Protein backbone atom coordinates (compact mmCIF):
# COMPACT_ATOMS: atom_id res chain seq x y z
CA UNK A 1 0.00 0.00 0.00
CA UNK A 2 0.88 3.69 -0.30
CA UNK A 3 2.40 4.64 3.04
CA UNK A 4 0.91 7.72 4.73
CA UNK A 5 3.04 10.85 4.73
CA UNK A 6 3.13 14.60 5.34
CA UNK A 7 1.95 16.86 2.53
CA UNK A 8 2.78 19.96 4.60
CA UNK A 9 3.07 20.63 8.35
CA UNK A 10 -0.34 19.70 9.77
CA UNK A 11 -1.52 18.04 6.51
CA UNK A 12 -1.26 14.28 6.02
CA UNK A 13 -2.22 11.90 3.26
CA UNK A 14 -3.85 8.75 4.67
CA UNK A 15 -5.69 7.43 1.62
CA UNK A 16 -4.70 4.89 -1.04
CA UNK A 17 -3.02 5.15 -4.43
CA UNK A 18 -6.24 6.26 -6.08
CA UNK A 19 -8.64 7.35 -3.32
CA UNK A 20 -7.81 10.42 -1.30
CA UNK A 21 -8.24 10.84 2.40
CA UNK A 22 -6.57 13.86 3.99
CA UNK A 23 -6.00 14.39 7.71
CA UNK A 24 -5.58 17.91 9.10
CA UNK A 25 -4.07 17.74 12.56
CA UNK A 26 -4.44 20.35 15.31
CA UNK A 27 -3.90 20.50 19.08
CA UNK A 28 -7.69 20.52 19.52
CA UNK A 29 -8.13 17.43 17.35
CA UNK A 30 -8.32 16.66 13.68
CA UNK A 31 -10.36 16.93 10.50
CA UNK A 32 -10.53 14.07 8.01
CA UNK A 33 -11.54 14.86 4.43
CA UNK A 34 -13.12 11.84 2.71
CA UNK A 35 -12.81 8.17 3.61
CA UNK A 36 -12.53 5.97 0.51
CA UNK A 37 -14.51 2.79 0.05
CA UNK A 38 -15.96 0.84 2.94
CA UNK A 39 -13.27 -1.73 2.12
CA UNK A 40 -10.67 1.08 2.45
CA UNK A 41 -11.62 1.93 6.04
CA UNK A 42 -9.34 -0.55 7.87
CA UNK A 43 -6.40 0.66 5.79
CA UNK A 44 -7.20 4.32 6.42
CA UNK A 45 -7.38 3.63 10.16
CA UNK A 46 -4.04 1.80 9.99
CA UNK A 47 -2.56 4.73 8.08
CA UNK A 48 -3.73 7.27 10.66
CA UNK A 49 -2.33 5.09 13.44
CA UNK A 50 0.95 4.56 11.59
CA UNK A 51 1.41 8.35 11.65
CA UNK A 52 0.93 8.33 15.42
CA UNK A 53 -2.49 9.98 15.47
CA UNK A 54 -5.61 8.72 17.21
CA UNK A 55 -8.94 8.09 15.51
CA UNK A 56 -10.50 9.27 18.76
CA UNK A 57 -9.03 12.74 18.17
CA UNK A 58 -10.80 13.25 14.82
CA UNK A 59 -13.52 15.82 15.48
CA UNK A 60 -14.93 16.21 11.97
CA UNK A 61 -15.19 14.14 8.80
CA UNK A 62 -15.97 16.25 5.73
CA UNK A 63 -17.28 14.71 2.48
CA UNK A 64 -16.65 16.00 -1.03
CA UNK A 65 -19.46 13.99 -2.62
CA UNK A 66 -21.63 10.99 -1.81
CA UNK A 67 -20.22 8.28 -4.07
CA UNK A 68 -18.94 4.99 -2.72
CA UNK A 69 -15.27 5.83 -3.31
CA UNK A 70 -15.36 8.93 -1.04
CA UNK A 71 -18.23 8.34 1.37
CA UNK A 72 -18.12 4.53 1.52
CA UNK A 73 -15.76 4.46 4.49
CA UNK A 74 -17.46 7.24 6.46
CA UNK A 75 -19.84 5.00 8.44
CA UNK A 76 -16.93 2.97 9.83
CA UNK A 77 -14.59 5.89 10.40
CA UNK A 78 -17.36 7.83 12.18
CA UNK A 79 -18.04 4.90 14.49
CA UNK A 80 -14.36 4.55 15.36
CA UNK A 81 -13.71 8.27 15.93
CA UNK A 82 -16.89 9.78 17.29
CA UNK A 83 -16.46 12.53 14.71
CA UNK A 84 -19.25 14.76 13.43
CA UNK A 85 -19.80 14.30 9.70
CA UNK A 86 -20.14 17.50 7.66
CA UNK A 87 -21.67 17.56 4.19
CA UNK A 88 -23.97 19.48 1.89
CA UNK A 89 -27.70 18.75 2.13
CA UNK A 90 -27.82 16.80 -1.14
CA UNK A 91 -24.82 14.71 -0.15
CA UNK A 92 -26.37 14.08 3.27
CA UNK A 93 -29.56 12.81 1.64
CA UNK A 94 -27.62 10.50 -0.68
CA UNK A 95 -25.45 9.23 2.20
CA UNK A 96 -28.61 8.51 4.23
CA UNK A 97 -29.70 6.30 1.32
CA UNK A 98 -26.34 4.54 1.02
CA UNK A 99 -25.72 6.00 -2.42
CA UNK A 100 -29.03 4.81 -3.88
CA UNK A 101 -31.38 6.96 -5.97
CA UNK A 102 -28.30 8.51 -7.61
CA UNK A 103 -29.41 10.72 -10.51
CA UNK A 104 -27.13 8.85 -12.96
CA UNK A 105 -26.35 5.53 -11.25
CA UNK A 106 -29.66 4.67 -9.59
CA UNK A 107 -28.87 1.86 -7.15
CA UNK A 108 -25.90 0.39 -9.06
CA UNK A 109 -23.12 1.42 -6.59
CA UNK A 110 -24.46 1.45 -3.01
CA UNK A 111 -22.40 1.86 0.16
CA UNK A 112 -23.02 1.80 3.92
CA UNK A 113 -25.56 4.46 4.90
CA UNK A 114 -24.30 7.16 7.22
CA UNK A 115 -25.94 9.98 9.16
CA UNK A 116 -24.53 13.43 8.47
CA UNK A 117 -24.49 15.45 11.67
CA UNK A 118 -23.92 18.97 10.35
CA UNK A 119 -25.02 20.37 7.05
CA UNK A 120 -22.73 22.66 5.11
CA UNK A 121 -23.90 25.75 3.24
CA UNK A 122 -21.77 27.51 0.64
CA UNK A 123 -19.06 29.60 2.29
CA UNK A 124 -19.75 28.19 5.76
CA UNK A 125 -16.72 28.00 8.04
CA UNK A 126 -15.68 25.74 10.91
CA UNK A 127 -12.73 26.56 13.15
CA UNK A 128 -10.58 24.03 15.01
CA UNK A 129 -7.18 24.48 16.65
CA UNK A 130 -6.06 27.41 14.49
CA UNK A 131 -7.35 25.92 11.21
CA UNK A 132 -10.40 27.12 9.28
CA UNK A 133 -12.38 24.72 7.09
CA UNK A 134 -14.76 26.29 4.58
CA UNK A 135 -17.19 24.75 2.11
CA UNK A 136 -17.06 25.71 -1.57
CA UNK A 137 -20.20 24.51 -3.35
CA UNK A 138 -19.06 22.99 -6.67
CA UNK A 139 -22.07 21.13 -8.12
CA UNK A 140 -22.22 19.27 -11.39
CA UNK A 141 -20.66 15.89 -10.77
CA UNK A 142 -23.46 15.58 -8.19
CA UNK A 143 -26.01 18.19 -7.09
CA UNK A 144 -24.26 18.52 -3.71
CA UNK A 145 -20.63 18.18 -4.74
CA UNK A 146 -18.42 20.25 -2.44
CA UNK A 147 -14.82 21.38 -2.52
CA UNK A 148 -13.09 22.37 0.71
CA UNK A 149 -10.93 25.39 1.45
CA UNK A 150 -8.57 25.14 4.42
CA UNK A 151 -6.66 28.01 5.96
CA UNK A 152 -3.86 26.39 7.91
CA UNK A 153 -2.48 27.72 11.17
CA UNK A 154 0.61 28.97 9.29
CA UNK A 155 -1.54 30.99 6.87
CA UNK A 156 -1.19 28.73 3.84
CA UNK A 157 -4.35 28.08 1.81
CA UNK A 158 -5.23 24.54 0.74
CA UNK A 159 -8.01 23.62 -1.70
CA UNK A 160 -9.34 20.08 -1.78
CA UNK A 161 -11.18 19.95 -5.09
CA UNK A 162 -14.09 17.69 -5.84
CA UNK A 163 -14.63 15.86 -9.09
CA UNK A 164 -15.58 17.87 -12.15
CA UNK A 165 -16.14 14.68 -14.19
CA UNK A 166 -19.41 13.83 -15.93
CA UNK A 167 -18.83 10.16 -16.90
CA UNK A 168 -21.64 8.84 -19.07
CA UNK A 169 -23.94 11.65 -17.97
CA UNK A 170 -26.76 12.73 -20.29
CA UNK A 171 -26.36 16.49 -20.42
CA UNK A 172 -29.41 17.40 -22.50
CA UNK A 173 -32.92 17.07 -21.06
CA UNK A 174 -31.68 15.24 -17.98
CA UNK A 175 -34.91 14.76 -16.07
CA UNK A 176 -33.15 13.63 -12.88
CA UNK A 177 -30.75 16.62 -12.59
CA UNK A 178 -31.97 19.29 -14.98
CA UNK A 179 -29.48 22.09 -14.17
CA UNK A 180 -26.25 20.08 -14.34
CA UNK A 181 -24.71 22.01 -17.29
CA UNK A 182 -25.27 25.41 -15.70
CA UNK A 183 -24.00 24.09 -12.37
CA UNK A 184 -20.77 22.55 -13.63
CA UNK A 185 -19.85 25.64 -15.68
CA UNK A 186 -20.23 27.77 -12.56
CA UNK A 187 -18.11 25.28 -10.64
CA UNK A 188 -15.29 25.68 -13.14
CA UNK A 189 -15.35 29.44 -12.64
CA UNK A 190 -15.56 29.14 -8.85
CA UNK A 191 -12.53 26.88 -8.57
CA UNK A 192 -10.26 28.54 -11.10
CA UNK A 193 -10.68 31.85 -9.24
CA UNK A 194 -9.45 30.46 -5.90
CA UNK A 195 -6.21 31.68 -4.44
CA UNK A 196 -4.41 28.52 -3.41
CA UNK A 197 -1.00 27.43 -2.13
CA UNK A 198 -1.58 23.65 -1.87
CA UNK A 199 -3.79 21.96 -4.48
CA UNK A 200 -5.33 18.64 -3.49
CA UNK A 201 -8.23 16.66 -4.90
CA UNK A 202 -10.30 13.60 -4.08
CA UNK A 203 -8.42 11.39 -6.56
CA UNK A 204 -4.63 11.27 -6.62
CA UNK A 205 -4.37 11.45 -10.40
CA UNK A 206 -6.28 14.75 -10.35
CA UNK A 207 -3.50 16.51 -8.38
CA UNK A 208 -0.35 14.53 -9.24
CA UNK A 209 -0.19 12.66 -5.93
CA UNK A 210 2.30 9.95 -6.79
CA UNK A 211 4.89 12.22 -8.38
CA UNK A 212 4.63 14.85 -5.65
CA UNK A 213 4.74 12.20 -2.91
CA UNK A 214 7.94 10.77 -4.35
CA UNK A 215 9.57 14.21 -4.57
CA UNK A 216 8.48 15.11 -1.02
CA UNK A 217 9.85 11.82 0.32
CA UNK A 218 13.17 12.66 -1.30
CA UNK A 219 13.48 16.05 0.37
CA UNK A 220 11.47 18.45 -1.80
CA UNK A 221 9.67 20.17 1.09
CA UNK A 222 7.52 22.31 -1.22
CA UNK A 223 6.48 19.48 -3.55
CA UNK A 224 2.77 20.06 -2.84
CA UNK A 225 2.96 23.85 -3.29
CA UNK A 226 1.19 24.14 -6.65
CA UNK A 227 -0.37 27.56 -7.12
CA UNK A 228 -1.50 26.96 -10.72
CA UNK A 229 -2.47 23.30 -10.38
CA UNK A 230 -6.11 23.93 -9.52
CA UNK A 231 -6.52 26.21 -12.55
CA UNK A 232 -4.93 23.53 -14.73
CA UNK A 233 -7.25 20.84 -13.34
CA UNK A 234 -10.22 23.08 -14.15
CA UNK A 235 -8.90 23.77 -17.64
CA UNK A 236 -8.50 20.07 -18.42
CA UNK A 237 -11.97 19.39 -17.00
CA UNK A 238 -13.58 22.23 -18.95
CA UNK A 239 -12.05 21.12 -22.23
CA UNK A 240 -13.38 17.59 -21.79
CA UNK A 241 -16.78 18.81 -20.61
CA UNK A 242 -17.26 21.22 -23.48
CA UNK A 243 -16.26 18.48 -25.96
CA UNK A 244 -18.79 16.21 -24.27
CA UNK A 245 -21.59 18.73 -24.53
CA UNK A 246 -20.74 19.42 -28.18
CA UNK A 247 -20.70 15.70 -28.94
CA UNK A 248 -24.11 15.21 -27.33
CA UNK A 249 -25.52 18.27 -29.13
CA UNK A 250 -24.32 16.87 -32.46
CA UNK A 251 -26.34 13.65 -32.05
CA UNK A 252 -28.87 14.06 -29.21
ZN1 LIG B 1 -18.31 10.60 -7.98
ZN1 LIG C 1 -14.14 9.42 -6.90
CATH number (domain holding residue 227): 3.60.15.10
Compute, in degrees rounded to 10, the torsion defined by CA atoms 108, 111, 113, 117: -110
> Could you tell me the residue range of the domain that residue 5 belongs to?
1-252
Determine contact, residues 233/206, Cβ cutoff 8 Å.
Answer: yes
DSSP 222: T
Q: In this structure, which residues have their CB less than 5 angstroms from ion ligand 1?
A: 67
User: What is the 149 CA–ligand 1 centroid distance (Å)?
Assistant: 19
Question: What angle (nearest 5°) sits at the alpha carbon of residue 122, between those of residues 90 and 188?
Answer: 90
- How far, in Å, CA of 207 to CA of 229, rounded? 7
The helix/strand/coil state of 149 is strand
CA 37, 60, 140, 92 dihedral sign is: positive
Q: How many CB atoms lie within 10 A of CB 242?
A: 12
Contact 5, 41 (CB under 8 A): no
Provide the residues around ligand 2 (an ion) whose CB is within 5 A.
Answer: 69
C-alpha span between 130 and 127 (Å, rounded): 7
Q: Are 33 and 42 spatial neighbours (Cβ–Cβ below 8 Å)?
A: no
247: Cβ–Cβ under 8 A, 6 or more apart, which residues?
Answer: none
Ramachandran angles phi, psi of 230, nearest 5°: -65, -45
Q: Is 195 exposed, middle or buried (0-12, 13-18, 19+ CB in 10 A)?
A: exposed
Q: For this experimental structure, what is the resolution in angstroms?
A: 1.5
The rounded Å distance from CA 66 to ligand 2 centre is 9
Tell how far the Cα of 69 is from the centroid of ligand 2, in angstroms: 5
Q: Mark residue 218 as left, alpha or beta (left: phi above 0; alpha: psi -120 to 50; beta: remaining).
A: alpha
Contact 148, 136 (CB under 8 A): yes
Considering every ligand atom shown, identify the ligand nearest to the alpha carbon of residue 65 and give its number.
Answer: 1
Round to whole Å and give the CA distance between 78 and 81.
Answer: 5
Catalytic residue IDs:
65, 67, 69-70, 141, 169, 203
Ligand in nearest proximity to the CA of 19: 2
**Among the residues of 118-179, which ranges form H helices?**
none
**Count of Cβ atoms closer than 10 Å to residue 172 Cβ:** 10
- For residue 142, the CA-to-ligand 2 centroid distance in Å is 11
Tally the domains of the chain.
Answer: 1
User: What does the alpha-carbon distance between residue 143 and residue 8 come to, in Å, rounded to a whole number?
Assistant: 31
- The experimental method, as deposited, was X-ray
Residues paired with 147 in a beta bridge = 136
First to last CA, the chain: 43
Q: Please report which helix (H) or strand (E) contains residue 198, including its range.
A: strand 198-201
Expressed in angstroms and rounded, the spacing between residue 67 Cα and the centre of ligand 2 is 7
Helix ranges (H only) for the chain are: 41-50, 68-71, 74-81, 89-96, 180-192, 204-207, 209-217, 229-250
| SS3 at position 85 | strand
**H or E segment and range at residue 2:** none
Per the CB < 8 A criterion, the answer to whether 207 and 229 are in contact is yes
Q: Are strands 146-151 and 157-161 parallel, antiparallel or unpaired?
A: antiparallel
Ligand nearest to the CA of 91: 1
Residues 6+ apart with CB under 8 A from 19: 34, 36, 37, 40, 69, 70, 202, 203, 204
Question: Of 24, 19, 20, 4, whose CA–CA distance to 152 is shortest?
Answer: 24
CA angle 97/78/12 to nearest 5° reads 120
Rounded-to-10 torsion of CA 206, 212, 214, 218: -170
Q: Which ligand is nearest to the CA of 69?
A: 2
Amino acid sequence: PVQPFAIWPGVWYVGTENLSSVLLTTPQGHILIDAGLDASAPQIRRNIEALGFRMADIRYIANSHAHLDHAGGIARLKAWSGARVIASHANAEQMARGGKEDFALGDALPFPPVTVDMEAQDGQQWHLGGVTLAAIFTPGHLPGATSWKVTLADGKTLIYADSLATPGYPLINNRNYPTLVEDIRRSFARLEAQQVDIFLANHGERFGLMDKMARKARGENNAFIDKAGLARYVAQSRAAFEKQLAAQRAQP
